[PDB]
Each structure stands twice: as structure tokens, then as C-alpha cells.
Design a binder for this molecule. Structure first.
Ligand SMILES: CC(=O)Nc1ncc(S(=O)(=O)NC(=O)C2(c3ccc(Cl)c(Cl)c3)CCC2)s1
Length: 167
């Protein structure tokens, strides 16, 4: 039993809610919240901009130190950093950005990072300003993630389309 409430069950291990990931993280304080990161951990917009804003830019400060020490992530890769006021940990995961011309096949590799964590609050990878088809992202999620994932979708219109098209 966990504290995630108001989720539709899609499969044995995948759940989906119409919720702002920022507010869901603040409410639940999950062990892991996933960020829709880029390789430079520059949290300017989309999910990342919103999560970082909610940390009062502390996520960005921590991220800049991480990059100065370690260099950029790989597309499809991830790192674990602090969750600040939102979660114990933040798993920064880099899905491919279609608007940069990046390989959509890397989406499966990106979701594989979730399997290193027993339970996660997450957005759909490569959705929104990353330019992928969110229905495809949900399919890859369900077919790749084996741990317990709670997906938060802000847009009600999108959420209903995701539910109504799910096989
Ligand atoms: C604060 C914040 O951004 N919180 C998020 N939680 C979850 C998400 S998301 O990754 O599911 N993206 C979305 O819902 C979209 C969206 C459409 C319209 C608006 Cl107004 C917003 Cl904010 C987001 C982008 C693709 C639909 S963004």
C-alpha cells in the first residue's frame, strides 16, 4: 500500500492520473520523482522548468555542479540527484527530443532507467515540448517499465485521449 490516490490502473504496474506533477510530488513526497531532463540539466521549460521553479532554483544550482563535475548525460540516460522539497530523490531522465532531431528509439532506453527504482512518480517521457507522440510514449512505458510507476499528466484533454486510446 502507498499514498498515491486518484489513479486509473492501466496494467499490473502502471497507473495514470490527471495531475500536475509538481503538486502531486508536494502532496505525496515520493521516494523518486522523475524529471524530463536534457543532457545539460538546463531546466528551462516544460516539466523541468516547473519542477525547478518549485525548488526555488535549488535543482538548477545542484545540477550545474553535477555537470561541472561529470559532464553531460547521454540521451536515454539518467542521474539521481536530490528531490529537494518535492521528493527524496529526483531521477533526471533524458528522453529523445524530436525537436532536436533525436532518435525516437532511445525512448525505450530512457524508460529502462525507471526499472532501477521500485516506485516512481513520473511524467510521460519525450511528451510536450520534447515533441514525441504521448500515446506512443505511454505504450513504450507500459512495455518497458516493470517497477511501479505513477504517471501524472497535467492536461485533462490529453489525459482523456490517453485513457480512451489505451490498448
Ligand atoms: C506545471 C507542469 O508543467 N506540470 C506538469 N505535470 C505533468 C505534465 S506533462 O508532462 O503530462 N505535460 C502536459 O500535461 C502537457 C501540458 C499541457 C498544458 C499545460 Cl497548461 C501544461 Cl502545464 C502541460 C504538455 C503535453 C500536455 S506538465
Amino acid at each position: 500500500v502507498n499514498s498515491f490516490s486518484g489513479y486509473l490502473k492501466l496494467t499490473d504496474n502502471v497507473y495514470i492520473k490527471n495531475a500536475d506533477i509538481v503538486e502531486e510530488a508536494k502532496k505525496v513526497k515520493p521516494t523518486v520523482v522523475v524529471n524530463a531532463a536534457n543532457v545539460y540539466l538546463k531546466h528551462g521549460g516544460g516539466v523541468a522548468g516547473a519542477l525547478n521553479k518549485a525548488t526555488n532554483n535549488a535543482m538548477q544550482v545542484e545540477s550545474d555542479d553535477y555537470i561541472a563535475t561529470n559532464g553531460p548525460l547521454k540521451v536515454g540516460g539518467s542521474c539521481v540527484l536530490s528531490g529537494h522539497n518535492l521528493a527524496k530523490h529526483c531521477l533526471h531522465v533524458v528522453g529523445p527530443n524530436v525537436n532536436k532531431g533525436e532518435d525516437i528509439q532511445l525512448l525505450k532506453s530512457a524508460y529502462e532507467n525507471f526499472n532501477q527504482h521500485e516506485v516512481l512518480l513520473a511524467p510521460l517521457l519525450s511528451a510536450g515540448i520534447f515533441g514525441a507522440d504521448p500515446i506512443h510514449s505511454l505504450r513504450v512505458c507500459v512495455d518497458t517499465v516493470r517497477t511501479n510507476v505513477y504517471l501524472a499528466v497535467f492536461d485533462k484533454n490529453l489525459y482523456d485521449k490517453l485513457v480512451s486510446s489505451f490498448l
